[PDB]
Amino acid sequence: AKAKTRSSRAGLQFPVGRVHRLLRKGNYAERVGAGAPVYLAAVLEYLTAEILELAGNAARDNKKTRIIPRHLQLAVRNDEELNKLLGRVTIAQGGVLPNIQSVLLPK
Amino acid sequence: AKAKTRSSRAGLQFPVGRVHRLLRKGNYAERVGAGAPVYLAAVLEYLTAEILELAGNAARDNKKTRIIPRHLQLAVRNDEELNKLLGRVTIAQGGVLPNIQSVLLPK
Amino acid sequence: TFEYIIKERALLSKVKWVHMIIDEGHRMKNAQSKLSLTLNTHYHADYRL
Amino acid sequence: RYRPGTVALREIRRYQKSTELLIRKLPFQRLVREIAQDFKTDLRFQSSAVMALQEASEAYLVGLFEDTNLCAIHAKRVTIMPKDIQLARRIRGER
Amino acid sequence: KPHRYRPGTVALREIRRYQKSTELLIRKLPFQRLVREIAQDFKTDLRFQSSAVMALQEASEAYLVGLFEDTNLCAIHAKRVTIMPKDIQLARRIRGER
Amino acid sequence: QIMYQQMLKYRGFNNQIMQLKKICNHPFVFEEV
Amino acid sequence: TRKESYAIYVYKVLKQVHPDTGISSKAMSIMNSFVNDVFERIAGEASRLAHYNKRSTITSREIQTAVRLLLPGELAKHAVSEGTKAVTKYTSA
Amino acid sequence: TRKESYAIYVYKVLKQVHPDTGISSKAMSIMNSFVNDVFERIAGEASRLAHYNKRSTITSREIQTAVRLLLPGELAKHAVSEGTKAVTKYTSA
Amino acid sequence: RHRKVLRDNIQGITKPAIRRLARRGGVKRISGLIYEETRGVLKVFLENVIRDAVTYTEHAKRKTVTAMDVVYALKRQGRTLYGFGG
Amino acid sequence: AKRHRKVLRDNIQGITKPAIRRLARRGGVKRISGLIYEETRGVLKVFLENVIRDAVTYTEHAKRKTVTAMDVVYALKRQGRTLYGFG
DNA sequence: TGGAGAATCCCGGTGCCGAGGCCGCTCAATTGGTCGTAGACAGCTCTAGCACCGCTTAAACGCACGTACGCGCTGTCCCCCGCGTTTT
DNA sequence: AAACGCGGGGGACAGCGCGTACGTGCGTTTAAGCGGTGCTAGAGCTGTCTACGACCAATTGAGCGGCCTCGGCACCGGGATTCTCCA
């Protein structure tokens, strides 16, 4: 009846009711305990907070107040657990980080 | 009515209504198009023949009428497309194919 | 002895025995253990005790 | 003039100081029509599917050249040789 | 005529016969005690499937054997038959582990 | 006697019969003790 | 307690294929695992296709598409034909 | 056509978290490419767990296990907190 | 009535492009043995995607190429990339 | 010594240097360095732990105390060491 | 250890299109009642993991040592790139 | 850009040295593992049970597509800076 999303109920921004609609519509199990959408969208909000910090951080480190994908590369890949977590996940136009090989560089 | 198993209709050993039952069970689609279980049980029996072939081959190559997982290793890992497709599948009590590095061989 | 009829089942059980004497049957207690069924590989003991 | 060898590394700076691709683009789009038209023709070629694979190619190749020199300097060379590349791709599991 | 070999010679039949055979190469009571020790270190007091013990061991010793080939690939690639740990760590590197 | 209550208050496996037979003879059967 | 397995069916394809070679139950278990293994592989790939094009009737056309995609070389084209073969035996029957 | 777009909610998190910094729509497309991708990774893992428990229910304990097995270190443990905590906020609201 | 079919732009991908990317990949003395040793191996990468990706197209009953099935194939190969929806 | 035993080594080191020699011969080592027997052991245990921690995680989500070979199937498949003959 | 110069980094002026919000207008997300049923959860049992030692004994370990190979050191030649070129 | 060259000098490479290491043999145990216990634990099997979100009716504002900017950052002009190669 009253359309009121669960993101304020859990303190999030991501629509946990869209999460529950997609959860019942994801057929992961028949009974879909609605706390499982919240356990999803909570980690969504928490890791979006984890990543937008780093993205704007690398942006402002590149003197930028808009996150470009190069800043996403410098955000994720410099983090050891993000690169350990996203070993095969890529950011388009993130580019490359500056690193010359050791005996290639003169000593 | 009775369990008159649907593999005999397809000339198979794998009961295609157990396969249709499993496809209705596996949440692959709402309607399970009744040839999809026959496609499944047919590819199944084709590969069962594929591997039981090389399995009996390697077993009698080891002069045993009992097909063992060591024979499964020595038949499967000798194949290009199988071991290319199963590079990450391990056979317990399969062991190694007998082969040495070339320069470690004494001269 | 106990384990030396177990490891030596291939020799002294081939020769025939008529009277066997087995001592201290409290280790003979378990029929699930290794010891008891090897006396049927000992194959004969007309007199027993 | 100069010797063989010197001006590599600032490139290794600048390319990796930068974010772009290092490849010709009319050969890129023509190569995409080339390879996708070889399986099934008559594809109306969106440039999305064209450019969607170049990051998947060039960055992995760049990663391969590091493994190449890893096997080259482990075998103590910087004139890199395909023995280093294919031993890498072996231990990468490509070769 | 005695057969004392020089450092290098005897190994290869084992390299034959191990790869001719299909088994594990480890004392199992130090292995099952390793299973119970390591699995206790995450959460103590498990009842312990020995099926789990060998189900780990088969993937263990195969991966172990699998690493030594790339180790000697780096070794002979660096022109060595005496393997080094730097071969192992470079092998794990190009394998993506290191 | 503190080991009687304290180690029973811990309550690995098969130790609860073993630990009380031990400490009444010696504490020195335990390596850490 | 008759519980449906594939041990007598792998036995059926065994004595259809290698009746000269009996089996160890270890190899039988490897194959019984493998049956449900690829039975889940191809059908999860097929449900992936059924969500690629948002479809709810997976037919043998869709398993044909999955066999086209997943399997390398002849393993596709044989399971293209063989997966059609008993299909043509069952669509007849 | 109301297509559930993830520019505004991720941007709400940006105005929560790095609000000085905007986000390019290439980067915003990286986020929009991230969203349902991650929403289905642990979801397929969790339905696999739901059949590992052989359950037609899924609770937040199941997502908790999806956090428990998989995530590296405190990325698990904070999401052990956070995934429960907003659940603890949703069980409070 | 004009048939537009292209072939081997991987040399239109220049050897200076390798003198670019080998530096981006950290190579100093790219020997002459390397430059075309590259150009075959990546082509192994090239067809194998589209061999599946064209396979997406016809069951989809289409005669165009989208990057949607590029993403289907790359994620299907474990080549996850963002910037494209998901 | 005889007064108190104190005769333990380890379980990772309970794997013997002839056992490392055995695996090194199955793996293709001609001359093992002495550092290999421990650099091997380290990465061996490194491989060992990550499986069984998530196997216990299964065991707790499946509410059990017996960590199974079923859990080894549940983990090794997911940890990329899929093994035939145990499930 | 030093200047000449070539590359880089930085800083000032321009402007723009993309980032972001504005304006409906749903439609999906919610609330509101089931709905048996799913797993909630009690009981039962029995088993299956449980250490443990008797003991062997061969495996591991204890050590002599012998030399092999891996590096110590060199000259090279080669070889690949750098500077210059233009065209494509 | 490509593209074609092109000194050019040192990097690959050969190759020789050297010395030690790492197996090898064999002496020395030794803990490996086997049996063999004794038992019991939670697994396992059942035993009911209810609650739980299902599901669907109503609703409703969510939120996002289409509609409004104007400004973060790119581009470029000019200069300062800063690394490198031959004195």
Residue numbers in the entry:
A (entry chain Q), B (entry chain U): 12 to 118
C (entry chain A): 872 to 920
D (entry chain S): 40 to 134
E (entry chain O): 37 to 134
F (entry chain A): 1020 to 1030, 1047 to 1068
G (entry chain V), H (entry chain R): 29 to 121
I (entry chain T): 17 to 102
J (entry chain P): 15 to 101
Article passage:
SWI/SNF is the prototype chromatin remodeling complex and regulates the expression of 5% genes in yeast. Within SWI/SNF, Snf2 functions as the ATP-dependent motor that drives the fundamental DNA translocation reaction underlying chromatin remodeling, whereas many of the auxiliary subunits target the enzyme to specific loci of the genome. To understand the mechanism of nucleosome recognition, we report the cryo-EM structure of the yeast SWI/SNF complex in complex with the mononucleosome. Based on the specific biological activities involved, the SWI/SNF complex is delineated into three functional modules: the motor module, the actin-related protein (ARP) module, and SRM.
To facilitate protein expression, truncated forms of Swi1 (residues 251–1336) and Snf2 (residues 430–1400) were used. The structure of the SWI/SNF–NCP complex was determined at an overall resolution of 6.9 Å, with a local resolution of 3.1 Å at the nucleosome bound with finger helix (FH) of Snf5, and a local resolution of 3.6 Å at the substrate recruitment module (SRM). The current higher-resolution map allowed us to identify several functionally important elements, such as the FH of Snf5 and a YEATS-like domain of Snf12 (more discussion below).
